[PDB]
Design a protein around this ligand. Structure first.
Ligand code: HEM
Ligand code: HEM
Ligand SMILES: Cc1cc(N)nc(CCc2cc(F)cc(CC[C@H]3CCCN3)c2)c1
Ligand SMILES: Cc1cc(N)nc(CCc2cc(F)cc(CC[C@H]3CCCN3)c2)c1
Ligand SMILES: C[C@H](O)[C@H](O)[C@H]1CNc2nc(N)[nH]c(=O)c2N1
Ligand SMILES: C[C@H](O)[C@H](O)[C@H]1CNc2nc(N)[nH]c(=O)c2N1
Ligand SMILES: [Zn+2]
Lengths: 408, 413
């Protein structure tokens, strides 16, 4: 059945037909919704998945049922038959990667989806090769602050024993250190990964903003440490346009958000190492990297310097302090000419993108729980936008952390 | 379905186990392939449909009073069954009415105030016959719940539906709301959310003061008759003028709001019985007024004027001038209510209380249905503990439900 979605602010109604093309499950049933749950091959399984993906590719280049399509179908059938897998053409790889982003229901940045620079690293064989590919990625995507979306795609899974993995959750992150006195220096979200790197030979500078090394696994082997050359790591000292004491907080962040722990699924092939990067939405740094209790947790410090009344929560001191931190982050990246988007502009673009997708595609899977920004939700247009969430493929999926599976 | 479902809190690592989802009754709107969790809304029951709905409820009530399988349990079952057999319906005992109303609140997945569910004052209005009578009951409800500012949660339950042609309805969506008037030039005076209902009231004979904060009259339908207008005595309408602890100019905005949030358009379902008029009231969370009522674009939309008086740069959105004004408006609302000693709760305290409530329900009841999309407040989402809390949503009965607007279905006499 066709499904309508209403924006209750504009009264705009869109009609979704695209959800009819999904097959993977969402985790909900008719009786229980799991919309706020973060996480709810063989030749036999492989050809239908390959067929569907090939079908939608040639349908996208408007040569469905062509001779080129027909021959690709048999080429792929014969290759699965004789090798238990197949290899994507370069055109298919690029199309698959763009559409995995296009289909990422949790991403508010998808208006850019077709401007993805795809780096084919399927010829990689060693961790040194991975490090070279990743440095080029970082260098290209950073582009001296004029950030450019990019993905680097390492070889697909074969038997599960020869996976390529970036053990880092993101290419650039700061270290976190469990202090003797109990607390945490650095980033508390990375305390475990930081200890894995120390356990592997990394000499930690035990600072507050120590860039972690890359820990890279090629073809199932033990992972190897690499230091990203610092000139490739663009950082922004966070200052504030009005509070001149803000720079004295000593804060900074990296310019390049680059997810490296996800799995890219295209035509039944699994790319366990596909680091992808874009540019930040300000709240990603300033609401949650700095103000989550289990993160940098600086709200108290900022509210202190703002001389706010912190005895009762109903003074909203946390909310004031939160806004000022996000002002500072936006102002800092913008003053350094480093690409960043505020959550008002990003959600604006997403509503526009949604309208584009409904028009040209028949829908747009979107995860309201993730799309609505972590602050000032209802003064953004997505808060009032009904969204339908469903799973389209190609897709980015979560996978287990490598240190839970790897036989050393 | 699987026997146990786990939800995680991603800030605290705490994991909870839900078994209550197995008692889920009606549907969520989601399927295996599509989730409708952000969709706002995803002729009576026959004898054969009613018997099992009644038994399910009666079993649950007697299990709650630790008398399950008792003689009075079996007797009540038999008396209900005879009643449905001969009259096609049945009447709840007062104990069961009270239990069912309290549990419809306890079960309301979209409500962050549920830690209070067991303290609901239930007013039995099932002897009402006329709209004047409904007006009396509702006035008594407002006065009791307002309590000179020390608000008390309450519900007034009018007669259940019979054949559908004799419904009791409060046509108002909430007992206390401000009028909205569309001007010929396209601007709106008052509350833009309430223009449609205001126009109905004017057609029904209301003389509008045509001001910014005019309380709407009650529009009340008894036993299926045409609805009738009543002015609530203004002394029963507690109001709070909005001022700011630092910005002396904030009171010059002439803003005020009423103290009592009182929903009057929902249907209460208990044991298959349908109470189409069941106004219920609590106290406000500050953001309901300071974010949605004042700062929604299609509402009072005062962000621009507040930012102007704060002298913020309103040309770039990256100045976050909207967010900065939103916080001060919410500071003023919380500070005005506390100064006048009217009960209100900020979103930090309400969400902490809800997490505590949810953990106890998981422990004592086996689960707590919650709609994250509605539970997380409309500002400062992730600095509240509910943001990081996974929640399972499902529909238990007794429950509060939406129902069509009465002007869409009423057969005019
Ligand atoms: C171009 C600028 C981009 C912006 C502003 C942006 C914005 C965002 C934000 C704010 C989130 C939620 C982040 C979180 O809270 O964890 C997100 C999620 C996501 N983005 Fe985008 N993104 C961008 C680029 C990309 C690219 C280039 C890809 C892939 C090629 C991508 C794929 C995803 C995926 C898969 C998620 C979901 C991750 C998860 O499930 O944890 N995004 N995006
Ligand atoms: C006592 C203090 C209470 C507080 C602080 C409170 C808080 C809230 C809030 C903030 C919402 C979301 C409102 C919105 O955004 O429209 C809500 C929804 C709801 N509340 Fe509570 N509430 C309270 C009392 C009650 C009572 C007494 C009942 C019923 C007996 C109730 C039943 C509901 C229901 C059914 C909803 C869903 C409304 C809808 O879907 O439109 N609440 N509540
Ligand atoms: C390509 C991309 C761009 C972007 N802009 N975002 C993401 C989402 C993943 C991500 C990467 C980061 F490098 C930082 C964050 C911040 C998330 C918030 C919530 C918890 C910690 N901060 C998210 C991906
Ligand atoms: C019993 C109760 C208490 C409370 N505290 N809340 C509600 C929710 C229903 C409601 C009634 C109102 F009178 C005002 C609001 C504000 C909610 C948002 C949506 C529309 C504008 N504000 C909500 C009910
Ligand atoms: C589209 C979306 O479902 C809609 O805007 C919802 C979002 N969450 C909400 N949450 C609450 N508490 N109240 C609301 O009215 C809404 N509106
Ligand atoms: C419990 C809940 O699913 C979890 O906290 C989600 C909520 N919404 C989110 N939204 C974004 N953008 N990012 C997140 O990490 C989360 N976390
Ligand atoms: Zn769902």
């Amino acid at each position: 059945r066709f499904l309508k979605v209403k924006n209750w602010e504009t009264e705009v109604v869109l009609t979704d037909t695209l959800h009819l093309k999904s097959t993977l499950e969402t985790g909900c049933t008719e009786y229980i919704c799991m919309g706020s749950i973060m996480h709810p091959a063989t030749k036999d399984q492989l050809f239908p998945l390959a067929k569907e993906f090939i079908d939608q590719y040639y349908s996208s280049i408007k040569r469905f049922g062509s001779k080129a399509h027909m021959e690709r179908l048999e080429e792929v059938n014969k290759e699965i038959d004789t090798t238990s897998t197949y290899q994507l053409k370069d055109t298919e790889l690029i199309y698959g990667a763009k559409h995995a982003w296009r289909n990422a229901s949790r991403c508010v940045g998808r208006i850019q989806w077709s401007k993805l620079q795809v780096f084919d690293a399927r010829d990689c064989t060693t961790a040194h090769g991975m490090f070279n590919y990743i440095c080029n990625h970082v260098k290209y995507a950073t582009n001296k602050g004029n950030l450019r979306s990019a993905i680097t795609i390492f070889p697909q899974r074969t038997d599960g024993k020869h996976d390529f993995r970036v053990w880092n959750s993101q290419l650039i992150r700061y270290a976190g250190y469990k202090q003797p006195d109990g607390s945490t220096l650095g980033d508390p979200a990375n305390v475990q990964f930081t200890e894995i790197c120390i356990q592997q030979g990394w000499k930690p500078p035990r600072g507050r903003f120590d860039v972690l090394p890359l820990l890279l696994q090629a073809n199932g082997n033990d992972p190897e440490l690499f230091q990203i050359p610092p000139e490739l790591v663009l950082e922004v000292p966070i200052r504030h346009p009005k509070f001149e004491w803000f720079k004295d907080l000593g804060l900074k962040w990296y310019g390049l958000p680059a997810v490296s722990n996800m799995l890219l699924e295209i035509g039944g092939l699994e790319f366990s190492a596909c680091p992808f990067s874009g540019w930040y939405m300000g709240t990603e740094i300033g609401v949650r990297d700095y103000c989550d209790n289990s993160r940098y947790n600086i709200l108290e410090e900022v509210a202190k310097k703002m001389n706010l009344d912190m005895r009762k929560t109903s003074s909203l001191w946390k909310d004031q302090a939160l806004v000022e931190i996000n002002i500072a982050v936006l102002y800092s990246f913008q003053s350094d000419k480093v690409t960043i988007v505020d959550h008002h502009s990003a959600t604006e673009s997403f509503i526009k993108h949604m309208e584009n997708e409904y028009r040209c595609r028949g829908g747009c899977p979107a995860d309201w729980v993730w799309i609505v920004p972590p602050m000032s939700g209802s003064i953004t247009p997505v808060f009032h936008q009904e969204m339908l969430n469903y799973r389209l493929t190609p897709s980015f999926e979560y996978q287990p952390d490598p240190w839970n599976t790897h036989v050393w």
